[PDB]
């Protein structure tokens, strides 16, 4: 049974440094008044925020981020949530870091109903360099979906409203989640996107702290005090340049509430990567988004993967989780057995292939709502901000954003805090 959904999701991105939090909540609340005040405001179903929304992000030692770490129903990121979800009866989604009863530290992202209710706790999976500077732990869980109850948000195709409920299967992605495993496993396991195929997600939801590549990565400058310096002249001149305080922008509000405006389909290049026009998307960034969900995305090749059965082996062989990943600390050759094949096999996929079809996903779709951060800390790191909405349709080569089976409902810019609001229409099958 076809379900067509209309959901209004709202993306807050802001630019939290480190030792600010009441000042973040405060910029928070007046963003959200701004919302209100709209010309085309209509109350969001759910509102999402970053990775670290209230924090920060760069914490150097366990010591430096304890003062700000809190369990997981309780603290400001948990009030401020639960204040949000009541006075828009939404489900809202933030970044924050936990601390357990049991002294373990954890990148984490709280969701509360519309009720007030905490109803789930994602922590992240695959970690980044930065979280092995304070103890962070991986998610013992791995990847995780949980059920988000929407109230009068669906309809059959015939009917005239959106008078109907609806229970949208859900995934939370911490930024690194989406990469490949450590930075060191194969690109195209595409281990995220992959559970999420796999799974049959609808929804899609990715907190993050994602970094511009005008930032300083590069280990031997990092740990080089010459090298070091020099980079981070280079880093100070291009935010003087621009007009920008060092930090980057705080306090001053791009709002794209209930527009239409699409972002325009574009190919990566030298000059996408540039950390110039603050209120225009980092293609370069939106464009490798897309392609890390190349599951999600058509591709003509696949048809003669699956005619050659090239992938059998590759569907057969993957494992839930990289083998020396947190979760196995779970018990990990079905074509030499006499087990039966079961069902969850057969979701299996890779490269978006299952046993069964040449693209699993195909006719379905899928909903990805990306929360990137803005700002710079400690004069090396520029987040690439540009948070968006995406839809998957499922529709039948090009692995970016010229792609058309992925449509670009609306992104912020990469340097500007604010806030995007899209009304998101879809369908689900029940």
Not at 129 to 136: G, L, R, S, Y
Request: hydrophobic share 35%; glycine share 6%.
């Amino acid at each position: 049974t076809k379900l067509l959904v209309s959901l209004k999701v709202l993306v807050i991105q802001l630019n939290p440094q480190i030792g600010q939090v009441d000042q973040t909540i405060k910029r928070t609340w007046s963003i959200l008044d701004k919302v209100t005040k709209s010309a085309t405001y209509v109350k969001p179903d759910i509102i999402l925020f970053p990775e670290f929304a209230l924090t920060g992000y760069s914490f150097h030692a366990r010591k430096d981020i304890l003062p700000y770490v809190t369990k997981k129903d309780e603290g400001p990121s948990f009030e401020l949530a639960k204040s949000i979800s009541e006075k828009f009866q939404c489900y809202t989604i933030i970044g924050y870091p936990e601390e357990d009863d049991e002294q373990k530290l954890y990148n984490s992202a709280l969701v509360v109903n519309p009720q007030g209710g905490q109803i789930f706790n994602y922590r992240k999976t695959f970690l980044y360099d930065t979280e092995m500077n304070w103890d962070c732990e991986e998610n013992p869980e791995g990847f995780q979906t949980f059920p988000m109850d929407f109230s009068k948000c669906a309809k059959l195709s015939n009917e005239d409203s959106y008078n109907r409920d609806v229970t949208l299967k859900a995934s939370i992605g911490i930024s690194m989640d989406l990469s490949p495993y450590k930075f060191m496993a194969p690109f195209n396991h595409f281990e995220f996107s992959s559970f999420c195929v796999d799974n049959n997600v609808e929804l899609i939801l990715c907190p993050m702290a994602w970094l511009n590549s005008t930032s300083i990565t590069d280990k031997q400058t990092l740990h080089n005090n010459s090298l070091l310096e020099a980079a981070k002249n280079k880093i100070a001149f291009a935010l003087k340049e621009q007009g920008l305080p060092l930090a980057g922008s705080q306090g001053i509000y791009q709002l794209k509430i209930g527009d239409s405006q699409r972002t325009p389909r574009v190919p990566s290049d030298d000059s996408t990567s540039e950390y110039k026009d603050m209120d225009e998307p980092d293609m370069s960034n939106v464009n490798y988004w897309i392609l890390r969900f190349f599951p999600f995305l058509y591709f003509k090749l696949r048809i003669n993967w699956f005619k050659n059965s090239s992938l059998i082996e590759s569907i057969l062989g993957k494992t839930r989780m990289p083998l020396d990943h947190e979760y196995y600390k779970k018990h990990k050759d079905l074509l030499d057995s006499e087990e039966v094949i079961k069902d969850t096999v057969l979701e299996k996929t890779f490269l978006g292939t299952s046993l069964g079809q040449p693209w699993k996903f195909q006719g379905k779709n899928a909903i990805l709502v990306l929360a990137n951060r803005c700002g710079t800390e400690d004069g090396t790191t520029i987040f690439a901000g540009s948070s968006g909405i995406y839809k998957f349709n499922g529709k039948k080569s090009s692995l970016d954003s010229l792609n058309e089976s992925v449509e670009l409902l609306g992104n912020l810019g990469k340097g500007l805090e604010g806030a995007i609001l899209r009304e998101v229409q879809f369908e689900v099958f029940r």
